[PDB]
């Protein structure tokens, strides 16, 4: 977000903001049977 | 694919104007791709 | 900056050196009893550098502008 | 940080925390 | 004056793989040396037969 | 005159549990010792 | 034996685009931007022998 | 021209540790190829 006002006056306001999520499952099965 | 952009303007006076523009652009790719391979062999031998 | 510069804890640093580059401020630097005084480097007043360089945890410490200003009692307490 | 003198302070706080296990055993 | 400018972004990505891979392999054989049974019973995934 | 504020916030929670759990057993009954050992080695002969 | 792959990639964005300026001795000007994006890629196999 | 001021708290605390051991023991077989697979299997 960005606001700017003025008339003699100034008022500035930022804003940032940031939610970043990661999420990884990986799975290996090996069954090897011999007779 | 397609773009569609319209444009309008205005103005009045004894003052009032607008000058306005939208425009919305759509993008499509479907890709394709299929293969299949079957086979059989036989052999009888005596 | 021509600090007075104790590089090891000096609870009344009273080495002055003329180190006396002209536009550069000095450090004084107080710990409690770990006081501290630098021919310091301008363009600095960083804690974490600061806390790294005299090995200090709970230092407090001004960037006291130009000459002589570095004086051990100028911090106060 | 205000001005009319200008005058600053700022503030930080943080944790910064890292752990690792690395656990390896095999038997023959 | 007054001023305002807003932004968002939301991205999204969600990937899901599945592999299943069975082999099975029974070679069987009656008389000839018991050597040359184990062998030739012995699957060579090459070259099954 | 000039009042400036500002807060940065942030985080990053990272966690990475990663395992592996092998089993093999080789049974080898019959003939010698030679070929009953290196049977029983952990490689398919 | 029947090998068979099938692979598909869907590719598709959306966007709008918005100004607008208006004096009346007051001034403004408004502007809006907004892009959509889905992707979808899909691949699929079975092996038989 | 300028007075510049500041202080804060610094804490680290670290426990690492790391443990490496190894038993290869081989019985019975010749003193050299039984030392060949104790070395090297
Ligand atoms: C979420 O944000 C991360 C971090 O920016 C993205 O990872 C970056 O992606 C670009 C494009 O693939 C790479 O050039 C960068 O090197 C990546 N950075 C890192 C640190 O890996 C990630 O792609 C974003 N996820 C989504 C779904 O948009
Ligand atoms: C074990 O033997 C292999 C094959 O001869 C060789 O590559 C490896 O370096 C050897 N390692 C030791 C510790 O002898």
Redesign the pocket.
């Known amino acids: 977000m960005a606001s700017k006002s003025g008339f003699s006056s100034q008022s500035d306001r930022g804003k940032h903001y940031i939610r970043?999520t990661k999420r990884f499952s990986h799975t290996k099965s090996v069954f090897l049977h011999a007779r | 694919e397609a773009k569609h952009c319209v444009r309008i303007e205005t103005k009045k006076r004894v003052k009032k104007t607008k000058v306005e523009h939208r425009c919305t652009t759509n993008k499509l790719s479907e890709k394709h791709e299929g293969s299949f391979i079957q086979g059989a062999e036989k052999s009888i031998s005596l | 900056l021509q600090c007075y510069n104790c590089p090891n804890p000096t609870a009344d640093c009273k080495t002055a050196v003329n180190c006396s580059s002209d536009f550069d401020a000095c450090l004084i630097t107080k710990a409690g009893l770990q006081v501290y005084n630098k021919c310091w480097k301008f363009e600095h007043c960083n804690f974490n550098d600061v806390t790294t360089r005299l090995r200090e945890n709970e230092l407090t410490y001004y960037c006291c502008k130009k000459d002589l200003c570095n004086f051990n009692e100028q911090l106060e307490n | 940080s205000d001005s009319f003198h200008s005058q600053d302070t700022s503030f930080l706080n943080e944790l910064n925390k890292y752990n690792e296990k690395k656990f390896i055993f095999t038997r023959i | 004056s007054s001023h305002g400018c807003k932004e968002l972004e939301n991205?999204?990505?969600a990937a899901s793989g599945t592999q299943n891979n069975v082999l099975r392999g029974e070679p069987f054989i009656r008389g000839g040396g018991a050597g040359f049974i184990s062998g030739l019973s012995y699957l060579e995934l090459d070259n099954p037969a | 005159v000039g009042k400036c504020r500002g807060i940065l916030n942030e985080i990053k929670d990272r966690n990475k549990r990663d395992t592996m759990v092998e089993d093999l057993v080789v049974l080898v009954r019959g003939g010698a010792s030679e070929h009953i050992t290196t049977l029983a080695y952990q490689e398919l002969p | 034996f029947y090998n068979s792959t099938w692979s598909y990639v869907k590719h598709t964005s959306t966007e709008h685009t918005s100004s607008s300026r208006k004096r009346s001795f007051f001034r403004s000007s408004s502007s809006s931007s907004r892009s959509y994006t889905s992707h979808t890629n899909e691949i699929h196999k079975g092996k038989s022998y | 021209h300028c007075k510049k001021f500041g202080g804060g708290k610094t804490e680290r605390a670290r426990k690492a540790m790391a443990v490496e051991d190894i038993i290869s023991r081989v019985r019975g077989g010749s003193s050299g190829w039984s030392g060949g697979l104790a070395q090297n299997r």
Do not use: C, G, S, V
Request: aromatic content about 0%; hydrophobic content about 50%; proline content about 0%.
């Open positions: 970043r | 991205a999204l990505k």
